[PDB]
Amino acid sequence: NLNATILGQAIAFVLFVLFAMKYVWPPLMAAIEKRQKEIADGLASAERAHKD
């Protein structure tokens, strides 16, 4: 006879915001950072190799 479902949804959103933000961000960061880091590292070390 209480609202209380708002409360439940909130607590779930807490644990799940931790779980959700955490897992994706380390990987997703590694990912976008991986595409960019790919062009970059290849280009920089590459330039070194070619010139030397």
Partner: protein, 211 residues
């Protein structure tokens, strides 16, 4: 026709939201957190492409992406608390755009490739192979109807699922049950939408392979 016209208004609004959000966020930013996800969508969509791949790749690729986007609209109603006469015949409306578009789709491959220039020939030595016309005919009709029957069946199954979980949650004075159902039902919903894109891909890879 509030419970009706209001509903078609609702689903229309969602679809527009899809349209504009596309070009708008697409010019920007995304950016990177955004860019990488767009990579999941587009590239996973490319792996999905191979399989059907080239035929509808712009046509079906754009479509399936829009289908996830537009499909999330139901999640919005589920997300609401997590009273109607938007989403009842807005959900019927989505089932109609999708299923109706599917019946349309058999034709769209039909003319788009033969397929349909050859589909009139579906009878063929296949209706001779298999020499009886009852086999080939019952088969093909069961196919055209069956495509609509499957796609529409999925659509209405989804909409109904929304309505029911809503009912269980809303009627009960005790919140906890409503919550557990709604969370489980929520995972259910996401799975359902992805399953829908997959279903479009299944009908489509069909089309490429179909006949």
């Amino acid at each position: 026709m509030f419970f009706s016209v209001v509903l078609g208004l609702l689903f229309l609004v969602l679809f527009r939201s899809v349209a504009k959000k596309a070009t708008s966020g697409v010019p920007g930013k995304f950016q990177t957190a955004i860019e990488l996800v767009i990579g999941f969508v587009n590239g996973s969509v490319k792996d999905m492409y191979h399989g059907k791949s080239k035929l509808i790749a712009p046509l079906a690729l754009t479509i399936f992406v829009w289908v996830f986007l537009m499909n999330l609209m139901d999640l919005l109603p589920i997300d609401l608390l997590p009273r109607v006469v938007p989403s009842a015949d807005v959900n019927v409306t989505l089932s109609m755009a999708l299923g109706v578009f599917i019946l349309i789709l058999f034709y769209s491959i039909k003319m788009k490739g033969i397929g349909g220039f050859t589909k009139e020939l579906t009878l063929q030595p296949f209706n001779h192979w298999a020499f009886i016309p009852v086999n080939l005919i019952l088969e093909g009709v069961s196919l055209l109807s069956k495509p609509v029957s499957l796609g529409l069946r999925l659509f209405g199954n989804m909409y109904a699922g929304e309505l029911i979980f809503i009912l269980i949650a809303g009627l009960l004075p005790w919140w906890s049950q409503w919550i557990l159902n709604v969370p489980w039902a929520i995972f259910h919903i996401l799975i359902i939408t992805l399953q829908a894109f997959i279903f479009m891909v299944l009908t489509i890879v069909y089309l490429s392979m179909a006949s």
